[PDB]
């Protein structure tokens, strides 16, 4: 939950940057389903078994 | 930060030119570590530069 600042440099042009942070600090993450991924991997494996 | 501390950001302060062509004021901003590189071989941990 970051917030933006406004620093003006030069004539009529501004540069944005992250300032303070409000709320507890946490870590970004990514999520995938396990069973679907395993089934897809097995399907790809059996399809690849023909060549090897 | 007020709520704690974060390891993936650094609080960098630097001088920037105002609307006046020759006049500088201090400003601050939080920057991610990968975009921060040590300046010179002189091991002065208080100085840094963008990766540019």
């Amino acid at each position, epitope marked *: 939950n970051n917030t933006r600042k406004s620093v003006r440099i030069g004539p009529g042009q501004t540069f944005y940057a992250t300032g303070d942070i409000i709320g507890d600090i946490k870590q970004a993450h990514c999520n995938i389903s396990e069973e679907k991924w395993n089934d897809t991997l097995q399907k790809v494996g059996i399809e690849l078994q023909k060549h090897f | 930060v007020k709520t*704690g501390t974060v390891e993936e950001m650094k609080n960098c302060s630097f001088n920037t030119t105002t609307e006046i062509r020759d006049k500088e004021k201090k400003e601050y901003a939080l920057f991610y570590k990968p975009d921060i590189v040590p300046l010179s071989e002189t091991n002065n941990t208080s100085e840094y530069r963008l990766i540019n």
Partner: antibody, heavy 127, light 111 residues
Framework: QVQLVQSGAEVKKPGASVKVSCKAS????????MHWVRQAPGQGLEWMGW????????NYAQKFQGRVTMTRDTSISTAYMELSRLRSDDTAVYYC????????????????????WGQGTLVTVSG | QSALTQPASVSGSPGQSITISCTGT?????????VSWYQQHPGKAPKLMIY???KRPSGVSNRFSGSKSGNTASLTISGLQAEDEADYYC??????????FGGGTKLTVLG
């Protein structure tokens, strides 16, 4: 069962500083936040702030910026709240409450659901 | 402060259904589903009665209930008894990792 206890009673001069200790048992102290609340006699109770015992981070509501400091001791699993610049209207009761679960993936500090409480502690400023 | 506006007191006879309201601006309760109702007897510490206004706690009877609509929540008690004589408060999440409590009320039993 889960148990929470605090100090018996405390009395201090006006404008002085006081400290309150709250201890918990029956569950892991590093797995949950800790909320602190104040209740004046016969008036609506006010929420002061919350503290995370893992990294020591704390947050407080307005009207208390810099006047109250909350820390903890993980080895003995206790929470300490220190207040300064007491006022005549500070005669009240204080309670510590167990909030949400520390997930490290989604924020849970702001959830207002806390169930386990303690007997509290009474503070008075006669003067 | 700009806490949650709440009535003063209510009353009802045993076996009667009585509801108490608690309202606030959109930021406090309108934009979020995080609400809680707390029961407090004199002297003893308060005890909570509902999670997110809908999910009931464990070990709590089915007499109490709660529901939110628009920018106001309502706590309903069915089958009043002598055990409900206590104070009731509404609290919610005010944004930016803050919690705000309501003014509170008192419940009286007729007869």
């Amino acid at each position: 069962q889960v148990q929470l206890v605090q100090s018996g009673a405390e009395v201090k001069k006006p404008g002085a500083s006081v400290k309150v200790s709250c201890k918990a048992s029956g569950y892991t102290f590093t797995g949950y936040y800790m909320h602190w609340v104040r209740q004046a006699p016969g008036q609506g109770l006010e929420w002061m702030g919350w503290i995370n015992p893992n990294s020591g981070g704390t947050n407080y509501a307005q009207k208390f910026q810099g006047r109250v400091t909350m820390t903890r001791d993980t080895s003995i699993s206790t929470a300490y709240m220190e207040l300064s610049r007491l006022r005549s209207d500070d005669t009240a009761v204080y309670y510590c409450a167990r909030g949400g679960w520390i997930s490290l993936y989604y924020d849970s500090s702001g959830y207002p659901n806390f169930d386990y409480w303690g007997q509290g502690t009474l503070v008075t400023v006669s003067g | 402060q700009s806490a949650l506006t709440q009535p003063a007191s209510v009353s009802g006879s045993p076996g009667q259904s009585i509801t108490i309201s608690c309202t606030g601006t959109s930021s406090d309760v309108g934009s979020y589903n995080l609400v809680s109702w707390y029961q407090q007897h004199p002297g003893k510490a308060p005890k909570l009665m509902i999670y997110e206004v809908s999910k009931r706690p464990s070990g709590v009877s089915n007499r109490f209930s709660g529901s939110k609509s628009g920018n106001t929540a309502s706590l309903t008690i069915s089958g009043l008894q002598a055990e409900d004589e206590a104070d009731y408060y509404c609290c919610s999440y005010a944004g930016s990792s803050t919690v705000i409590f309501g003014g509170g009320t008192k419940l009286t039993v007729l007869g």
